[PDB]
C-alpha cells in the first residue's frame, strides 16, 4: 500500500501533461519557429481564448494527445 501511494504521488512530480504536439516543416528558421509558437500561445491560451480556429502554415502538423490518468488507479489491489 505504501509503495502504491508513493507511485501514485510520483506522477505529479515527474509526469508531463502535453495538450498539442506541433510538427514543423524542416524548411523553417528556428527563430521564426519560436516567434510562431509565441504567437500561437498568445492566441490560444486561457479560457478567454477558447473555441477559436487554428490556422497552420503549409507543411505543419497538429495532433491532440491526452494522458494516462487511468493508470494510477489500483482499486482492485488496494
Amino acid at each position: 500500500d505504501q509503495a502504491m501511494s508513493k507511485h501514485q504521488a510520483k506522477f505529479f512530480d515527474n509526469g508531463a501533461t502535453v495538450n498539442l504536439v506541433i510538427k514543423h516543416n524542416p524548411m523553417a528558421d528556428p527563430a521564426a519557429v519560436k516567434k510562431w509558437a509565441d504567437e500561437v500561445n498568445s492566441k490560444h491560451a486561457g479560457v478567454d481564448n477558447a473555441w477559436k480556429n487554428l490556422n497552420l502554415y503549409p507543411g505543419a502538423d497538429a495532433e491532440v494527445v491526452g494522458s494516462n490518468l487511468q493508470e494510477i488507479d489500483f482499486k482492485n489491489v488496494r
Binding site: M27, D29, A31, K35, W36, D38, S42, H44, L54, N55
Partner: protein, 167 residues
C-alpha cells in the same frame, strides 16, 4: 544596398548599362522581400509601421531583429516604451499588465530593425547568385543540346530569413 559594381564582371557583361543592372537587382530584391515579408540587409532607422491590433498579450512586429524602439502610439495615445518588454530575436513586444487593442490600424510603431552589411553576408551572396542565374539564360541543334516556380526558386536560398504566416 547592392550596386552593379558588386556583381562579377562576367555577370556585369550582359547588361547594356548600370541602370539595367540596378533594375534587375531591384526586381530580385522586391521578390525576395515579398517572399520573406521584410527587408534584411539595410538598417532602416525610425521606420514607421502601421499594424493591426492582435488583442492578446504580445504584439508581433514584422521584424526578426529588433534593435531598439523609439515611440509607440496606440489609438492616438502614446505609451511608455520603457515599460514594454522587448525581444531582439523574436521582434515582439509584451505589455506586463493588460492587453493590446483588437481594432484595425490602431497601433503605430517607430523602431530601428534589421542586420548591418557586416553580418548579413549570406543574404547579399544569395541575391547576387540569384541575379546571375536568372540573367544566365529537350532541344538539340547539331552538337548543342539542352535538357530541362518562383516559390521553389526563392525557397532554395532565402529560407532562413522568412517569417512564418501569423496563426
Amino acid at each position: 544596398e547592392l550596386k552593379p559594381d558588386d556583381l562579377p564582371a562576367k555577370v556585369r557583361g550582359q547588361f547594356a548599362d548600370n541602370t539595367e543592372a540596378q533594375a534587375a537587382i531591384d526586381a530580385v530584391l522586391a521578390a525576395a522581400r515579398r517572399w520573406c515579408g521584410w527587408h534584411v540587409s539595410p538598417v532602416i532607422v525610425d521606420d514607421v509601421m502601421e499594424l493591426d491590433g492582435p488583442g492578446g498579450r504580445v504584439l508581433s512586429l514584422p521584424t526578426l531583429n529588433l534593435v531598439s524602439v523609439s515611440s509607440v502610439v496606440e489609438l492616438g495615445h502614446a505609451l511608455d516604451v520603457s515599460t514594454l518588454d522587448r525581444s531582439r530575436r523574436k521582434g515582439t513586444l509584451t505589455k506586463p499588465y493588460g492587453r493590446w487593442t483588437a481594432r484595425d490600424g490602431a497601433i503605430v510603431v517607430t523602431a530601428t530593425h534589421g542586420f548591418t552589411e557586416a553580418e548579413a553576408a549570406d543574404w547579399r551572396r544569395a541575391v547576387v547568385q540569384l541575379v546571375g542565374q536568372r540573367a544566365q539564360t529537350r532541344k538539340k541543334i547539331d552538337d548543342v543540346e539542352y535538357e530541362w516556380s518562383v516559390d521553389a526558386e526563392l525557397s532554395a536560398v532565402f529560407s532562413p530569413f522568412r517569417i512564418l504566416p501569423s496563426p
